[PDB]
Every structure is written in C-alpha cells, then in structure tokens.
Ligand binder design. Structure first.
Ligand SMILES: [Au+]
Ligand SMILES: [Au+]
Ligand SMILES: [Au+]
Ligand SMILES: [Au+]
Ligand SMILES: [Au+]
Ligand SMILES: [Au+]
Ligand SMILES: [Au+]
Ligand SMILES: [Au+]
Ligand SMILES: [Au+]
Ligand SMILES: [Au+]
Ligand SMILES: [Au+]
Ligand SMILES: [Au+]
Ligand SMILES: [Au+]
Ligand SMILES: [Au+]
Ligand SMILES: [Au+]
Ligand SMILES: [Au+]
Ligand SMILES: [Au+]
Ligand SMILES: [Au+]
Ligand SMILES: [Au+]
Ligand SMILES: [Au+]
Ligand SMILES: [Au+]
Ligand SMILES: [Au+]
Ligand SMILES: [Au+]
Ligand SMILES: [Au+]
Ligand SMILES: [Au+]
Ligand SMILES: [Au+]
Ligand SMILES: [Au+]
Ligand SMILES: [Au+]
Ligand SMILES: [Au+]
Ligand SMILES: [Au+]
Ligand SMILES: [Au+]
Ligand SMILES: [Au+]
Lengths: 171, 171, 171, 171
C-alpha cells in the first residue's frame, strides 16, 4: 500500500496520472511531426530535429511526473495514448501553429493542476510544478511564438525576407 | 499582437511595467549615491563601489522583469525616470538609511505584485518573483541592516569602535 | 567643497551634467528599442541584441562623464530621465533610422560641449571628449549608416537581396 | 644646428625648458618629502613611499619633455634646481596640502604652455601635453584631494574615524 503518503489527495493523484497521459500524447504528436519533416518530399531536417527534440522533452516531463507520483506515494496508472490529431502536418507554419496549440493545452493543464494543488493545500505539488514545468512551458511557448513570427515574415514578403537576412546574416 | 499570452492579466502586465520603473529609478538613485561618495570632498571609495554595484543589480532586476514581460506576451511600456530624492546624500550612515528605505519600498512593491498574482491565480508570476526577487531583497536588506548597525557602532563610541576592530582584525 | 577644481568653468560643469542626462536618456531609448525587438510578435533577436549592447555603451559613456565631472571637482546633478519618444519602434529600418537620429543628436551635443571647452580654454575637457567620445560616435554612426544602407537594399528588391547574399555568403 | 625643426617657436622651446625645471624641482621637493617621512621621529613609511614614487613620476615627466624638446629640434637648457620650500614638512596633512599646491602649480604651468602652443598654432605640442600630462595631473590632483579629505576625516573625530574604518575594513 503506502507507508509514505501524506497530504496527497486522491484528486491530485488522479490529475497527475491524466497529465502524464497528456505529456506522453504530446511526445507522440511531436514524434509524428518530426518524422513528417524527415519525409523525402518534405525534407526539412532542421524542423524534424526541432520536433524530435520536443518529443524527448515531453517524454522527460512525463517521467518526472511519474517519479513525483511515486515520491508522494500515489499510484501511476496509464491509459491508451491517443494517436496524433493529423497524419500529415502541412507547412512549417502549419506545424508550428499546431505545436503552440498543443503547448498551450499542456500549459493550461499545468495551471489547472496548480489550482487544484492550491485548493488542496498541497504546497509540494505547487512547487514541483513551478520549479519543473511552468517556466519551461512559458519559455517554450515564447520561443514558438518567436518562430511563428519569423516563419510568417519569411514566407510573407520581400521586406520580411530582407529583415530576416539582415538580422541573421549581419547582426 | 500576441500569439502566446495565456493566464496573464492586464492588471499584472501594468503592475510589472510599474515595477520596472521602480527598479530603474532605484538603479538611478544608486548611481547618484555612488558618484556622491566619489566626490573629492567625500572620498569614500568603498561606499561608492557598494552603491554602484547596487545600481547594476537594480538595473539587472528591471531587465529580468522586462524579459519576463515579453515571455508572458505583455507589452513593456516605459515612463519618465524620476530623478533621485536628493542631490547630496550626507554621511555614510544617512546614505545607508536612505538605501534601506529604498529597498523596503521595492520589497513592498514585490509583495504587492505577489499578492496581485496570487489573486489573479498566476502561479508563473508568483514563482518568478519568489525565485528571482523576494529572497534577493531579503538578503540585501539584512546586509544593509548589518551595515547600519556597524556604521552606528563605529561612529558612536570608543566601546563600539573597539568591538568592531576586535571582530574585524582579530576574529 | 572643492580643494581640486582648477580651470573648470561653471558653464562646462553644467553642460557636462546635461550631456550625462542625454547619454542616460539615449541608453533608456536603446533599452526600449531592444525589448521591442524581443517581443514575440517582432522577434528579431539580433536587432534586440544590437540595441541592448548600445544601451550599455551609452550608460558607460554617462558614467565616464560622471567620473570626469568628479575628477575636475564639478558636482554631478541628475535630472528626470525622459521616457523614449516612442512605445513601438516599427520596422528594423524605422528603428535604425531613429537610432542614427539619436546618435547625431548626441554627436552634436559632444561637438557643442567641445566648442564650449575650446572657448573656455579647457584643454583637459577637449582632450577627454576627443579621446573617449568623438571617434566612438563617428565609428558608430558610420556602422549605422552601413546598416541603414543594407537594410534598405535587402527590403527594397531582388537585385538588392542578391548583392547582399553574394557579399555575405560568397565574399 | 637643426635640420629637423619645423613649426616650433622659440617661445615654446623656452617654455618647455622652464617646465622641465619645474618638473625637476617638483621631483626634488618630493624626494625631500619622502625622506622626511622616513625619519625615525616621523616614521610613516607609507607616506614616504607615496612621495618617493611621486619624485620618480615628476622626473619621468621632465625626461619626457626633454625627449620631446629634442624631437622638435629645440635645445634643452638646464637651470639651477632650487631647493624645496621647506626642510621639515609637518604632519601628513601639512605635507599632502603642500603636495596639492605643488601639483596645481605644475598643472597651471601645463595649461599656460598649452595656451601658448595654441596661440602659436603648434598642434604637436598641444597633443603631446594632452596625451602625456594634462590627464595625469588631473588624476593625481583628484587622488590627492581624496587623500586630503580622508586625512582630515581621520585626524578630526570619532565619527570621521568610524566612517573610514567601515569603508576600509568592511566595504
Ligand atoms: Au531530424
Ligand atoms: Au499551486
Ligand atoms: Au500555490
Ligand atoms: Au499550494
Ligand atoms: Au503554493
Ligand atoms: Au504553486
Ligand atoms: Au542567414
Ligand atoms: Au543568408
Ligand atoms: Au566606486
Ligand atoms: Au504570489
Ligand atoms: Au502564490
Ligand atoms: Au500565485
Ligand atoms: Au503561488
Ligand atoms: Au508566489
Ligand atoms: Au580591521
Ligand atoms: Au584595524
Ligand atoms: Au537581444
Ligand atoms: Au574642444
Ligand atoms: Au580644442
Ligand atoms: Au580646448
Ligand atoms: Au584643444
Ligand atoms: Au578638443
Ligand atoms: Au549569408
Ligand atoms: Au545565405
Ligand atoms: Au618609503
Ligand atoms: Au594647446
Ligand atoms: Au590646442
Ligand atoms: Au594647438
Ligand atoms: Au590643438
Ligand atoms: Au591641445
Ligand atoms: Au582598515
Ligand atoms: Au581596521
């Protein structure tokens, strides 16, 4: 059973298991994104590598949650990992948009679990999320927003392309 | 506009801009303090260096807030930086007293923004302040209180001066 | 008071204090420019870094002036730092144009203070400006003019973009 | 005779010879100051070393002027070096006051020679003084003013002594 569990509600335990599922599903979505850009008829290896690295980060996030589940004396329970929402991911722009949607949904789930932990007076959980997940997600979303802007600029116009080249190759 | 902003209230955005102003104003006060002690008719270079280093720390605090503003998808807005409250800063004791007043006012502003973030259920903001600012301010205020005590002891009496020398040159 | 002041007119002392203000205001303008380009909806990090580095250079210029003020036995007096002329800075081209306007205004202020020092027969001041500021400003303005030309070329046309790429990636 | 002399007035040549004399006399005054503080009944070796180092700097200043005299095709002419104005130099405070008087008189002589060079349209001379002497004198006078303030503070009072110790042994 558990000799260790203290101040760890069944509501948080359940929500932690759900968040693990969401992180693993995110990892799986990114695996699909990465191999799509590795297709010979797409062939954007930088984009492939970006998404494959994100698959690894999301997996690592799930494993940290699972480690924490056991540290608190909760019981990891795994569900079906639903296949990604698309089989083909369109352009770099389409993919980066789908990625930011995905991250904002993980972010919201983190914030929801944080609010639950707060309601349950579970400061360990709250700190765990703050320390390992909330700032990581904020940083990643800012980087993806940056990328979305640059992709839009580059695909949009002569002026846009110009500004990118000056910044990248001069500054 | 912003593709990234999530769970980031207009109230916090505004308060962050105000706190940047207060940190920059603090930095400017410390620049003035440092150059006052560099005057040939004051000539306390250790005191000058202490305040100039604080000017840099307060600037760095503002820049971290501005970075965070952008990471959250808020919009940095800058105001007039009001000149420091004094043109001449009196003795080392007067200056260290003015410094602790200034830090306690920054501290209170941090605590006020923390309470706002808490009311707004913005755990990212709360953690950001805790991790980068609240303990830094507590440590600095304790160091300034230490200094105030030693300055008072040294300027006050034979017994005071004695105790300082034993501690400094023997212990 | 001052045991050291020699050949240092009240007119130069005052003008030095004003120039410190202008350099600090320039630094503040560049802080605003840098964080604008760090926005997720602008996202030109090279441009951000260029302006943030200029903020630091302008701050260092003010500190050197303040050091010189004290070395001559003048009294540093600080005024309100007026907020930058814009909250949003437009394109890279708009920003680099605003930057060169700003530098030419600092340059003219340097030349005006130089003429004053010359009228006042203050060769120390004249040399200080020549040695630490006039050539620095000339070099920076030439670099910004270079940048303005390249930005215009890159945003302007196929021929322009072509010439830039050949120069950058071949030569 | 001189195959090299160009744009080098007899007025500047003469004034350069006089300035060499003043620098050598300053060096001699500092030699006397240094050995006075080496007396067993005075015994302030730090003060001795400060003045002996200044004797060397003033000698080096004269030698640089003499080198410049020859580089311009002028003729070094040496006069009697008058013995220092005092045989005994009183307290550290008295000595540092006499030192700043001496430096201000060298400084004024530099500024006078600068004005002559300017009147004579001799930019080489003007630059030579600016580059090797005017800023050196400004820095040294600021350091002596600093010292005068600290000596006065230390000899004056409990509060003064206190402030010095805090700055020196804490900051
Ligand atoms: Au890849
Ligand atoms: Au929480
Ligand atoms: Au919490
Ligand atoms: Au909590
Ligand atoms: Au908490
Ligand atoms: Au929390
Ligand atoms: Au590039
Ligand atoms: Au390129
Ligand atoms: Au200093
Ligand atoms: Au908070
Ligand atoms: Au909180
Ligand atoms: Au919070
Ligand atoms: Au919190
Ligand atoms: Au908090
Ligand atoms: Au000591
Ligand atoms: Au001591
Ligand atoms: Au940057
Ligand atoms: Au000048
Ligand atoms: Au001049
Ligand atoms: Au001049
Ligand atoms: Au000049
Ligand atoms: Au000049
Ligand atoms: Au290139
Ligand atoms: Au290229
Ligand atoms: Au000595
Ligand atoms: Au001159
Ligand atoms: Au001149
Ligand atoms: Au000249
Ligand atoms: Au000149
Ligand atoms: Au000159
Ligand atoms: Au000491
Ligand atoms: Au001591």
């Amino acid at each position: 059973s558990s000799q260790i569990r203290q101040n760890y509600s069944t509501e948080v335990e359940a929500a932690v298991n759900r968040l693990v599922n969401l992180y693993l599903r995110a990892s799986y979505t990114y695996l699909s994104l990465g191999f799509y850009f590795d297709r010979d008829d797409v062939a954007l290896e930088g984009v492939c590598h970006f998404f494959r690295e994100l698959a690894e980060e999301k997996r690592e996030g799930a494993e940290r949650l699972l480690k924490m589940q056991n540290q608190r004396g909760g019981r990891a329970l795994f569900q079906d990992l639903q296949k990604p929402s698309q089989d083909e991911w369109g352009t770099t722009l389409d993919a980066m948009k789908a990625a930011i949607v995905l991250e904002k949904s993980l972010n919201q789930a983190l914030l929801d679990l944080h609010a639950l932990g707060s309601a349950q007076a579970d400061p360990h959980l709250c700190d765990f999320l703050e320390s390992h997940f909330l700032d990581e997600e904020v940083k990643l979303i800012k980087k993806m927003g940056d990328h979305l802007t640059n992709i839009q600029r580059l695909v949009g116009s002569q002026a846009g392309l110009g500004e990118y080249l000056f910044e990248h190759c001069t500054l």
